[PDB]
Amino acid sequence: MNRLILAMDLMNRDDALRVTGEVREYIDTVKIGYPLVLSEGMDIIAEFRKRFGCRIIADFKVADIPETNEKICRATFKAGADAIIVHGFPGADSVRACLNVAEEMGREVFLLTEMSHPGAEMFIQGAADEIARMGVDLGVKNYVGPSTRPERLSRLREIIGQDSFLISPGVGAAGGDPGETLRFADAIIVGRSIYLADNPAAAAAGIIESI
Amino acid sequence: MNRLILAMDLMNRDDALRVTGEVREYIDTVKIGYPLVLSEGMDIIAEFRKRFGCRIIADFKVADIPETNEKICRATFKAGADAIIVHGFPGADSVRACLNVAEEMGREVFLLTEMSHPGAEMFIQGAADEIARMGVDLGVKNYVGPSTRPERLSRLREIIGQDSFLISPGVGAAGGDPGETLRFADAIIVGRSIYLADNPAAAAAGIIESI
Ligand SMILES: O=c1cnn([C@@H]2O[C@H](COP(=O)(O)O)[C@@H](O)[C@H]2O)c(=O)[nH]1
Numbered sequence: 001m002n003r004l005i006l007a008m009d010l011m012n013r014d015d016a017l018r019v020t021g022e023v024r025e026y027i028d029t030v031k032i033g034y035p036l037v038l039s040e041g042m043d044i045i046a047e048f049r050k051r052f053g054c055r056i057i058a059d060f061k062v063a064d065i066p067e068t069n070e071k072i073c074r075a076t077f078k079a080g081a082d083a084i085i086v087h088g089f090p091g092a093d094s095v096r097a098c099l100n101v102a103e104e105m106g107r108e109v110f111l112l113t114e115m116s117h118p119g120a121e122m123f124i125q126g127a128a129d130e131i132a133r134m135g136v137d138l139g140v141k142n143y144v145g146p147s148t149r150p151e152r153l154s155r156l157r158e159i160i161g162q163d164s165f166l167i168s169p170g171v172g173a174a175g176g177d178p179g180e181t182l183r184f185a186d187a188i189i190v191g192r193s194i195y196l197a198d199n200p201a202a203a204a205a206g207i208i209e210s211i
Numbered sequence: 212m213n214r215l216i217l218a219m220d221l222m223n224r225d226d227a228l229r230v231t232g233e234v235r236e237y238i239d240t241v242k243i244g245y246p247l248v249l250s251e252g253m254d255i256i257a258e259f260r261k262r263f264g265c266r267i268i269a270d271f272k273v274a275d276i277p278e279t280n281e282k283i284c285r286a287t288f289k290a291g292a293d294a295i296i297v298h299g300f301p302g303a304d305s306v307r308a309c310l311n312v313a314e315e316m317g318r319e320v321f322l323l324t325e326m327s328h329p330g331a332e333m334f335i336q337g338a339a340d341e342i343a344r345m346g347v348d349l350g351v352k353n354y355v356g357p358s359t360r361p362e363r364l365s366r367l368r369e370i371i372g373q374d375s376f377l378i379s380p381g382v383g384a385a386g387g388d389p390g391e392t393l394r395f396a397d398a399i400i401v402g403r404s405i406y407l408a409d410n411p412a413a414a415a416a417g418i419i420e421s422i
Protein backbone atom coordinates (compact mmCIF):
# COMPACT_ATOMS: atom_id res chain seq x y z
CA MET A 1 0.00 0.00 0.00
CA ASN A 2 1.37 3.37 -1.09
CA ARG A 3 4.58 1.50 -2.02
CA LEU A 4 5.65 2.13 1.59
CA ILE A 5 6.89 -0.48 4.07
CA LEU A 6 7.40 0.51 7.69
CA ALA A 7 10.70 -0.64 9.25
CA MET A 8 9.56 -1.15 12.84
CA ASP A 9 12.82 -1.10 14.77
CA LEU A 10 11.60 0.33 18.06
CA MET A 11 12.57 -2.04 20.85
CA ASN A 12 9.61 -1.95 23.18
CA ARG A 13 6.23 -3.44 22.41
CA ASP A 14 4.13 -0.52 23.59
CA ASP A 15 5.94 2.06 21.46
CA ALA A 16 6.06 -0.29 18.48
CA LEU A 17 2.34 -0.97 18.67
CA ARG A 18 1.53 2.72 19.11
CA VAL A 19 3.51 3.88 16.08
CA THR A 20 2.43 1.01 13.85
CA GLY A 21 -1.21 1.67 14.73
CA GLU A 22 -0.81 5.39 13.97
CA VAL A 23 0.50 4.76 10.48
CA ARG A 24 -1.53 1.67 9.54
CA GLU A 25 -3.87 3.57 7.25
CA TYR A 26 -0.85 4.33 5.06
CA ILE A 27 0.69 0.86 4.91
CA ASP A 28 -0.21 -2.80 4.71
CA THR A 29 3.29 -4.21 5.11
CA VAL A 30 5.55 -4.02 8.17
CA LYS A 31 9.20 -5.09 8.25
CA ILE A 32 10.08 -6.51 11.69
CA GLY A 33 13.72 -7.19 12.53
CA TYR A 34 15.90 -8.35 15.37
CA PRO A 35 15.79 -5.05 17.33
CA LEU A 36 12.10 -5.71 18.12
CA VAL A 37 12.12 -9.51 18.09
CA LEU A 38 15.15 -9.94 20.38
CA SER A 39 13.59 -7.48 22.82
CA GLU A 40 9.96 -8.67 22.83
CA GLY A 41 10.01 -12.21 21.44
CA MET A 42 9.01 -13.95 18.21
CA ASP A 43 5.35 -13.89 19.31
CA ILE A 44 5.33 -10.19 18.37
CA ILE A 45 5.12 -11.21 14.68
CA ALA A 46 1.76 -13.00 15.06
CA GLU A 47 0.50 -10.22 17.30
CA PHE A 48 1.25 -7.56 14.67
CA ARG A 49 -0.14 -9.63 11.82
CA LYS A 50 -3.39 -10.14 13.72
CA ARG A 51 -3.81 -6.70 15.24
CA PHE A 52 -2.95 -4.77 12.09
CA GLY A 53 -3.87 -7.27 9.39
CA CYS A 54 -0.63 -6.44 7.63
CA ARG A 55 1.91 -8.62 5.85
CA ILE A 56 5.11 -9.09 7.87
CA ILE A 57 8.57 -9.28 6.33
CA ALA A 58 11.12 -10.67 8.87
CA ASP A 59 14.37 -8.78 8.26
CA PHE A 60 16.69 -11.34 9.73
CA LYS A 61 19.61 -10.94 7.28
CA VAL A 62 19.94 -14.73 7.27
CA ALA A 63 23.62 -15.40 6.82
CA ASP A 64 24.59 -18.80 8.15
CA ILE A 65 25.46 -22.26 6.76
CA PRO A 66 22.69 -24.14 4.97
CA GLU A 67 21.63 -26.30 7.89
CA THR A 68 21.31 -23.39 10.29
CA ASN A 69 19.59 -21.24 7.67
CA GLU A 70 16.96 -23.97 7.30
CA LYS A 71 16.35 -23.89 11.06
CA ILE A 72 16.10 -20.08 11.19
CA CYS A 73 13.63 -19.94 8.29
CA ARG A 74 11.46 -22.69 9.74
CA ALA A 75 11.19 -20.93 13.11
CA THR A 76 10.48 -17.62 11.40
CA PHE A 77 7.69 -18.94 9.21
CA LYS A 78 6.25 -20.94 12.14
CA ALA A 79 6.05 -17.57 13.92
CA GLY A 80 3.84 -16.26 11.14
CA ALA A 81 6.16 -14.17 8.96
CA ASP A 82 5.11 -13.85 5.31
CA ALA A 83 8.66 -13.46 4.03
CA ILE A 84 12.24 -13.41 5.22
CA ILE A 85 15.23 -11.31 4.09
CA VAL A 86 18.33 -13.37 3.43
CA HIS A 87 21.91 -12.37 2.60
CA GLY A 88 23.30 -13.65 -0.66
CA PHE A 89 26.93 -13.26 0.15
CA PRO A 90 27.33 -16.54 2.06
CA GLY A 91 26.65 -18.31 -1.28
CA ALA A 92 24.11 -20.26 -3.28
CA ASP A 93 23.74 -23.26 -1.00
CA SER A 94 22.88 -20.95 1.90
CA VAL A 95 20.24 -19.18 -0.18
CA ARG A 96 18.84 -22.45 -1.55
CA ALA A 97 18.32 -23.73 1.99
CA CYS A 98 16.08 -20.71 2.64
CA LEU A 99 14.20 -21.15 -0.65
CA ASN A 100 13.59 -24.84 0.21
CA VAL A 101 11.92 -23.98 3.48
CA ALA A 102 9.90 -21.15 1.94
CA GLU A 103 8.63 -23.63 -0.67
CA GLU A 104 7.72 -26.15 2.01
CA MET A 105 5.84 -23.53 4.02
CA GLY A 106 4.25 -21.47 1.24
CA ARG A 107 6.26 -18.35 2.03
CA GLU A 108 8.75 -16.04 0.32
CA VAL A 109 12.45 -15.21 0.39
CA PHE A 110 13.79 -11.72 -0.34
CA LEU A 111 17.43 -11.71 -1.44
CA LEU A 112 19.57 -8.83 -0.15
CA THR A 113 22.16 -7.99 -2.87
CA GLU A 114 23.83 -4.69 -1.98
CA MET A 115 23.42 -2.88 1.33
CA SER A 116 22.64 0.81 1.86
CA HIS A 117 25.15 1.94 4.50
CA PRO A 118 28.64 3.33 3.82
CA GLY A 119 30.46 0.13 4.78
CA ALA A 120 28.59 -1.71 2.02
CA GLU A 121 31.14 -0.33 -0.44
CA MET A 122 33.97 -2.29 1.13
CA PHE A 123 33.05 -5.83 0.11
CA ILE A 124 29.39 -6.19 -0.72
CA GLN A 125 29.16 -3.75 -3.60
CA GLY A 126 31.93 -5.55 -5.51
CA ALA A 127 30.01 -8.83 -5.29
CA ALA A 128 26.50 -7.40 -5.65
CA ASP A 129 25.96 -7.91 -9.36
CA GLU A 130 27.09 -11.53 -9.08
CA ILE A 131 24.85 -12.03 -6.02
CA ALA A 132 21.86 -10.70 -8.00
CA ARG A 133 22.63 -12.96 -10.95
CA MET A 134 22.89 -15.89 -8.53
CA GLY A 135 19.44 -14.97 -7.27
CA VAL A 136 18.05 -14.99 -10.79
CA ASP A 137 19.66 -18.40 -11.46
CA LEU A 138 18.08 -19.78 -8.24
CA GLY A 139 14.63 -18.52 -9.13
CA VAL A 140 14.49 -15.72 -6.57
CA LYS A 141 11.73 -13.22 -7.35
CA ASN A 142 12.06 -10.72 -4.49
CA TYR A 143 15.07 -8.51 -3.86
CA VAL A 144 16.42 -5.77 -1.59
CA GLY A 145 18.71 -3.03 -2.93
CA PRO A 146 19.99 0.41 -1.74
CA SER A 147 18.08 3.68 -1.78
CA THR A 148 21.35 5.52 -1.07
CA ARG A 149 22.81 4.50 -4.44
CA PRO A 150 20.17 4.79 -7.18
CA GLU A 151 22.73 4.02 -9.91
CA ARG A 152 23.37 0.68 -8.16
CA LEU A 153 19.62 0.19 -7.71
CA SER A 154 19.27 0.74 -11.46
CA ARG A 155 21.99 -1.84 -12.21
CA LEU A 156 20.24 -4.30 -9.85
CA ARG A 157 16.89 -3.70 -11.52
CA GLU A 158 18.61 -4.35 -14.84
CA ILE A 159 19.84 -7.77 -13.72
CA ILE A 160 16.62 -8.97 -12.07
CA GLY A 161 14.19 -7.78 -14.69
CA GLN A 162 10.96 -5.82 -14.43
CA ASP A 163 8.92 -8.79 -13.24
CA SER A 164 10.90 -9.21 -10.01
CA PHE A 165 9.77 -7.36 -6.85
CA LEU A 166 12.39 -4.97 -5.42
CA ILE A 167 12.17 -3.17 -2.09
CA SER A 168 14.65 -0.57 -0.95
CA PRO A 169 15.88 0.73 2.47
CA GLY A 170 18.08 3.73 3.25
CA VAL A 171 15.23 6.25 2.64
CA GLY A 172 15.17 9.37 4.79
CA ALA A 173 17.58 9.05 7.68
CA ALA A 174 20.35 7.42 5.62
CA GLY A 175 20.00 9.92 2.80
CA GLY A 176 17.86 8.15 0.24
CA ASP A 177 15.06 9.94 -1.64
CA PRO A 178 11.56 8.39 -1.93
CA GLY A 179 10.81 9.51 -5.46
CA GLU A 180 14.19 8.71 -6.99
CA THR A 181 14.27 5.31 -5.33
CA LEU A 182 10.81 4.46 -6.69
CA ARG A 183 12.11 5.04 -10.22
CA PHE A 184 13.65 1.57 -9.78
CA ALA A 185 12.20 -0.16 -6.71
CA ASP A 186 8.57 -1.25 -6.31
CA ALA A 187 8.48 -0.15 -2.69
CA ILE A 188 10.53 1.86 -0.24
CA ILE A 189 11.32 0.85 3.33
CA VAL A 190 11.24 3.68 5.88
CA GLY A 191 12.12 3.36 9.54
CA ARG A 192 13.47 6.30 11.59
CA SER A 193 11.98 9.11 9.44
CA ILE A 194 8.63 7.74 10.56
CA TYR A 195 9.13 6.05 13.94
CA LEU A 196 11.27 8.78 15.54
CA ALA A 197 9.06 11.59 14.19
CA ASP A 198 7.03 13.72 16.57
CA ASN A 199 3.99 12.71 14.46
CA PRO A 200 4.62 9.36 12.68
CA ALA A 201 1.31 9.60 10.81
CA ALA A 202 2.17 13.08 9.48
CA ALA A 203 5.64 11.87 8.50
CA ALA A 204 4.19 8.86 6.63
CA ALA A 205 1.57 11.08 4.97
CA GLY A 206 4.30 13.49 3.87
CA ILE A 207 6.35 10.76 2.22
CA ILE A 208 3.30 9.37 0.43
CA GLU A 209 2.35 12.80 -0.87
CA SER A 210 5.91 13.56 -2.01
CA ILE A 211 5.62 10.60 -4.38
CA MET B 212 -10.95 -4.11 4.18
CA ASN B 213 -14.51 -2.78 4.19
CA ARG B 214 -15.42 -5.87 6.26
CA LEU B 215 -15.98 -7.58 2.90
CA ILE B 216 -14.48 -10.91 1.77
CA LEU B 217 -14.94 -12.01 -1.82
CA ALA B 218 -16.02 -15.65 -2.28
CA MET B 219 -14.28 -16.41 -5.58
CA ASP B 220 -16.16 -19.46 -6.82
CA LEU B 221 -15.85 -18.93 -10.57
CA MET B 222 -14.29 -22.02 -12.11
CA ASN B 223 -12.01 -20.65 -14.76
CA ARG B 224 -8.81 -18.76 -14.09
CA ASP B 225 -9.36 -15.96 -16.58
CA ASP B 226 -12.80 -15.02 -15.25
CA ALA B 227 -11.66 -15.39 -11.65
CA LEU B 228 -8.67 -13.13 -12.20
CA ARG B 229 -10.76 -10.56 -14.07
CA VAL B 230 -13.43 -10.25 -11.38
CA THR B 231 -10.98 -10.31 -8.48
CA GLY B 232 -8.91 -7.58 -10.13
CA GLU B 233 -12.02 -5.45 -10.71
CA VAL B 234 -13.01 -5.51 -7.06
CA ARG B 235 -9.57 -5.48 -5.43
CA GLU B 236 -9.79 -1.84 -4.40
CA TYR B 237 -12.71 -2.82 -2.17
CA ILE B 238 -11.22 -5.89 -0.52
CA ASP B 239 -7.98 -7.28 0.84
CA THR B 240 -9.20 -10.81 1.57
CA VAL B 241 -10.32 -13.45 -0.93
CA LYS B 242 -11.94 -16.76 0.00
CA ILE B 243 -10.91 -19.48 -2.50
CA GLY B 244 -12.68 -22.83 -2.42
CA TYR B 245 -12.80 -26.12 -4.24
CA PRO B 246 -14.81 -24.84 -7.25
CA LEU B 247 -11.75 -22.81 -8.36
CA VAL B 248 -8.99 -25.01 -6.95
CA LEU B 249 -10.30 -28.31 -8.39
CA SER B 250 -10.65 -26.62 -11.78
CA GLU B 251 -7.39 -24.66 -11.96
CA GLY B 252 -5.07 -26.25 -9.39
CA MET B 253 -3.67 -25.36 -5.98
CA ASP B 254 -1.11 -23.05 -7.62
CA ILE B 255 -3.96 -20.54 -8.09
CA ILE B 256 -3.68 -19.65 -4.38
CA ALA B 257 -0.10 -18.37 -4.63
CA GLU B 258 -0.92 -16.65 -7.91
CA PHE B 259 -3.80 -14.70 -6.34
CA ARG B 260 -1.85 -13.86 -3.21
CA LYS B 261 1.00 -12.46 -5.30
CA ARG B 262 -0.99 -10.72 -8.02
CA PHE B 263 -3.49 -9.08 -5.68
CA GLY B 264 -1.51 -8.88 -2.45
CA CYS B 265 -4.55 -10.14 -0.59
CA ARG B 266 -4.93 -12.61 2.25
CA ILE B 267 -6.37 -15.96 1.10
CA ILE B 268 -8.78 -18.04 3.16
CA ALA B 269 -9.03 -21.63 1.76
CA ASP B 270 -12.66 -22.69 2.18
CA PHE B 271 -12.07 -26.40 2.15
CA LYS B 272 -14.71 -27.41 4.73
CA VAL B 273 -12.16 -29.84 6.17
CA ALA B 274 -14.18 -32.76 7.45
CA ASP B 275 -12.11 -35.92 7.62
CA ILE B 276 -10.40 -38.06 10.28
CA PRO B 277 -7.48 -36.47 12.14
CA GLU B 278 -4.72 -38.00 10.07
CA THR B 279 -6.23 -36.95 6.76
CA ASN B 280 -7.10 -33.51 8.10
CA GLU B 281 -3.44 -33.02 8.99
CA LYS B 282 -2.46 -33.90 5.40
CA ILE B 283 -5.06 -31.55 3.87
CA CYS B 284 -4.01 -28.62 6.06
CA ARG B 285 -0.32 -29.15 5.36
CA ALA B 286 -0.86 -29.15 1.60
CA THR B 287 -3.10 -26.09 1.85
CA PHE B 288 -0.66 -24.02 3.86
CA LYS B 289 2.25 -25.19 1.66
CA ALA B 290 0.22 -23.73 -1.22
CA GLY B 291 0.25 -20.36 0.48
CA ALA B 292 -3.17 -20.06 2.11
CA ASP B 293 -3.32 -17.79 5.17
CA ALA B 294 -6.17 -19.69 6.80
CA ILE B 295 -8.38 -22.71 6.29
CA ILE B 296 -12.07 -23.28 7.07
CA VAL B 297 -12.73 -26.49 8.93
CA HIS B 298 -15.97 -28.24 9.93
CA GLY B 299 -16.50 -28.81 13.62
CA PHE B 300 -19.05 -31.53 13.34
CA PRO B 301 -16.60 -34.41 12.84
CA GLY B 302 -15.41 -33.74 16.43
CA ALA B 303 -12.64 -32.29 18.54
CA ASP B 304 -9.82 -34.57 17.47
CA SER B 305 -10.46 -33.65 13.84
CA VAL B 306 -10.35 -29.94 14.66
CA ARG B 307 -7.26 -30.32 16.87
CA ALA B 308 -5.39 -31.96 14.00
CA CYS B 309 -6.01 -28.81 11.94
CA LEU B 310 -5.00 -26.51 14.80
CA ASN B 311 -1.75 -28.50 15.24
CA VAL B 312 -0.73 -27.97 11.65
CA ALA B 313 -1.72 -24.29 11.70
CA GLU B 314 0.50 -23.86 14.78
CA GLU B 315 3.39 -25.63 13.08
CA MET B 316 3.05 -23.45 9.97
CA GLY B 317 2.14 -20.10 11.51
CA ARG B 318 -1.35 -20.05 10.00
CA GLU B 319 -4.97 -19.92 11.15
CA VAL B 320 -8.00 -22.16 11.40
CA PHE B 321 -11.57 -20.86 11.03
CA LEU B 322 -14.17 -23.11 12.66
CA LEU B 323 -17.47 -23.48 10.78
CA THR B 324 -20.25 -23.90 13.41
CA GLU B 325 -23.62 -23.53 11.68
CA MET B 326 -24.12 -23.38 7.92
CA SER B 327 -26.22 -20.87 5.97
CA HIS B 328 -28.25 -23.00 3.56
CA PRO B 329 -31.69 -24.50 4.26
CA GLY B 330 -30.40 -28.03 4.85
CA ALA B 331 -28.28 -26.74 7.73
CA GLU B 332 -31.38 -26.91 9.92
CA MET B 333 -31.56 -30.68 9.65
CA PHE B 334 -28.54 -31.69 11.72
CA ILE B 335 -25.99 -28.92 12.00
CA GLN B 336 -28.11 -26.30 13.72
CA GLY B 337 -28.94 -28.68 16.59
CA ALA B 338 -25.24 -29.25 17.24
CA ALA B 339 -24.02 -25.73 16.47
CA ASP B 340 -23.91 -24.29 19.97
CA GLU B 341 -21.97 -27.32 21.21
CA ILE B 342 -19.61 -27.07 18.21
CA ALA B 343 -18.93 -23.40 19.04
CA ARG B 344 -18.28 -24.20 22.70
CA MET B 345 -15.91 -26.97 21.58
CA GLY B 346 -14.09 -24.36 19.52
CA VAL B 347 -13.74 -22.09 22.52
CA ASP B 348 -12.43 -25.00 24.63
CA LEU B 349 -9.83 -25.80 21.91
CA GLY B 350 -8.62 -22.23 21.70
CA VAL B 351 -10.15 -21.43 18.31
CA LYS B 352 -10.28 -17.68 17.67
CA ASN B 353 -11.84 -17.51 14.19
CA TYR B 354 -15.34 -18.66 13.32
CA VAL B 355 -17.87 -18.89 10.47
CA GLY B 356 -21.61 -18.48 11.09
CA PRO B 357 -24.77 -17.87 8.97
CA SER B 358 -25.91 -14.56 7.51
CA THR B 359 -29.29 -16.14 6.74
CA ARG B 360 -30.07 -16.58 10.45
CA PRO B 361 -29.00 -13.49 12.42
CA GLU B 362 -30.59 -14.82 15.63
CA ARG B 363 -28.27 -17.86 15.34
CA LEU B 364 -25.36 -15.56 14.47
CA SER B 365 -26.16 -13.63 17.66
CA ARG B 366 -26.20 -16.85 19.73
CA LEU B 367 -22.85 -17.84 18.16
CA ARG B 368 -21.35 -14.44 18.92
CA GLU B 369 -22.57 -14.88 22.48
CA ILE B 370 -20.70 -18.16 22.89
CA ILE B 371 -17.41 -17.10 21.28
CA GLY B 372 -17.11 -13.69 22.84
CA GLN B 373 -16.36 -10.28 21.36
CA ASP B 374 -12.64 -10.93 21.00
CA SER B 375 -13.11 -13.80 18.52
CA PHE B 376 -13.19 -13.04 14.76
CA LEU B 377 -16.42 -14.09 13.03
CA ILE B 378 -17.04 -14.10 9.28
CA SER B 379 -20.39 -14.81 7.71
CA PRO B 380 -21.58 -16.19 4.31
CA GLY B 381 -25.10 -16.34 2.88
CA VAL B 382 -25.16 -12.59 2.05
CA GLY B 383 -27.04 -11.51 -1.06
CA ALA B 384 -27.92 -14.50 -3.19
CA ALA B 385 -28.90 -16.72 -0.24
CA GLY B 386 -30.97 -14.00 1.38
CA GLY B 387 -28.68 -12.54 4.01
CA ASP B 388 -28.46 -8.78 4.61
CA PRO B 389 -25.06 -7.01 4.85
CA GLY B 390 -25.97 -4.54 7.56
CA GLU B 391 -27.88 -6.92 9.82
CA THR B 392 -25.16 -9.55 9.54
CA LEU B 393 -22.49 -7.02 10.52
CA ARG B 394 -24.36 -6.36 13.76
CA PHE B 395 -22.77 -9.65 14.87
CA ALA B 396 -20.03 -10.70 12.44
CA ASP B 397 -16.76 -8.82 11.86
CA ALA B 398 -16.90 -9.42 8.12
CA ILE B 399 -19.32 -10.65 5.49
CA ILE B 400 -18.51 -13.10 2.72
CA VAL B 401 -20.10 -12.33 -0.66
CA GLY B 402 -19.83 -14.48 -3.76
CA ARG B 403 -22.53 -14.50 -6.47
CA SER B 404 -23.96 -11.01 -5.76
CA ILE B 405 -20.56 -9.76 -6.86
CA TYR B 406 -19.08 -12.32 -9.27
CA LEU B 407 -22.23 -12.89 -11.36
CA ALA B 408 -23.05 -9.16 -11.51
CA ASP B 409 -22.86 -7.30 -14.80
CA ASN B 410 -20.47 -4.90 -13.01
CA PRO B 411 -18.74 -6.66 -10.05
CA ALA B 412 -17.03 -3.42 -8.98
CA ALA B 413 -20.37 -1.56 -8.88
CA ALA B 414 -21.94 -4.44 -6.96
CA ALA B 415 -19.09 -4.44 -4.39
CA ALA B 416 -19.26 -0.64 -4.12
CA GLY B 417 -23.02 -0.85 -3.52
CA ILE B 418 -22.65 -3.33 -0.67
CA ILE B 419 -19.92 -1.26 0.96
CA GLU B 420 -22.01 1.89 0.75
CA SER B 421 -25.11 0.13 2.11
CA ILE B 422 -23.16 -0.50 5.31
O1 LIG C 1 20.89 -2.47 3.06
C1 LIG C 1 20.11 -2.44 3.99
C2 LIG C 1 19.34 -3.54 4.48
N1 LIG C 1 18.50 -3.40 5.48
N2 LIG C 1 18.32 -2.18 6.11
C3 LIG C 1 17.34 -2.11 7.17
O2 LIG C 1 16.22 -1.35 6.74
C4 LIG C 1 15.77 -0.47 7.79
C5 LIG C 1 16.03 0.97 7.36
O3 LIG C 1 15.65 1.81 8.48
P1 LIG C 1 15.87 3.39 8.49
O4 LIG C 1 14.75 4.02 7.57
O5 LIG C 1 15.58 3.79 9.90
O6 LIG C 1 17.27 3.76 8.07
C6 LIG C 1 16.43 -0.97 9.06
O7 LIG C 1 15.63 -1.96 9.72
C7 LIG C 1 17.72 -1.61 8.54
O8 LIG C 1 18.20 -2.66 9.38
C8 LIG C 1 19.03 -1.04 5.72
O9 LIG C 1 18.85 0.01 6.28
N3 LIG C 1 19.91 -1.22 4.66
Ligand SMILES: O=c1cnn([C@@H]2O[C@H](COP(=O)(O)O)[C@@H](O)[C@H]2O)c(=O)[nH]1
Pocket residue numbers: 218220244270323325326327328355356357380381382383384385400401402403404
Ligand atom coordinates in the same frame (compact mmCIF):
# COMPACT_ATOMS: atom_id res chain seq x y z
O1 LIG D 1 -22.46 -21.93 5.76
C1 LIG D 1 -21.81 -21.67 4.77
C2 LIG D 1 -20.41 -21.92 4.59
N1 LIG D 1 -19.79 -21.59 3.48
N2 LIG D 1 -20.46 -20.97 2.43
C3 LIG D 1 -19.68 -20.60 1.27
O2 LIG D 1 -19.57 -19.19 1.20
C4 LIG D 1 -19.74 -18.73 -0.15
C5 LIG D 1 -21.03 -17.93 -0.24
O3 LIG D 1 -21.21 -17.57 -1.63
P1 LIG D 1 -22.51 -16.82 -2.17
O4 LIG D 1 -22.38 -15.31 -1.74
O5 LIG D 1 -22.38 -16.89 -3.66
O6 LIG D 1 -23.78 -17.48 -1.69
C6 LIG D 1 -19.60 -19.96 -1.03
O7 LIG D 1 -18.23 -20.19 -1.41
C7 LIG D 1 -20.07 -21.09 -0.11
O8 LIG D 1 -19.48 -22.35 -0.41
C8 LIG D 1 -21.83 -20.69 2.50
O9 LIG D 1 -22.38 -20.16 1.57
N3 LIG D 1 -22.45 -21.06 3.68
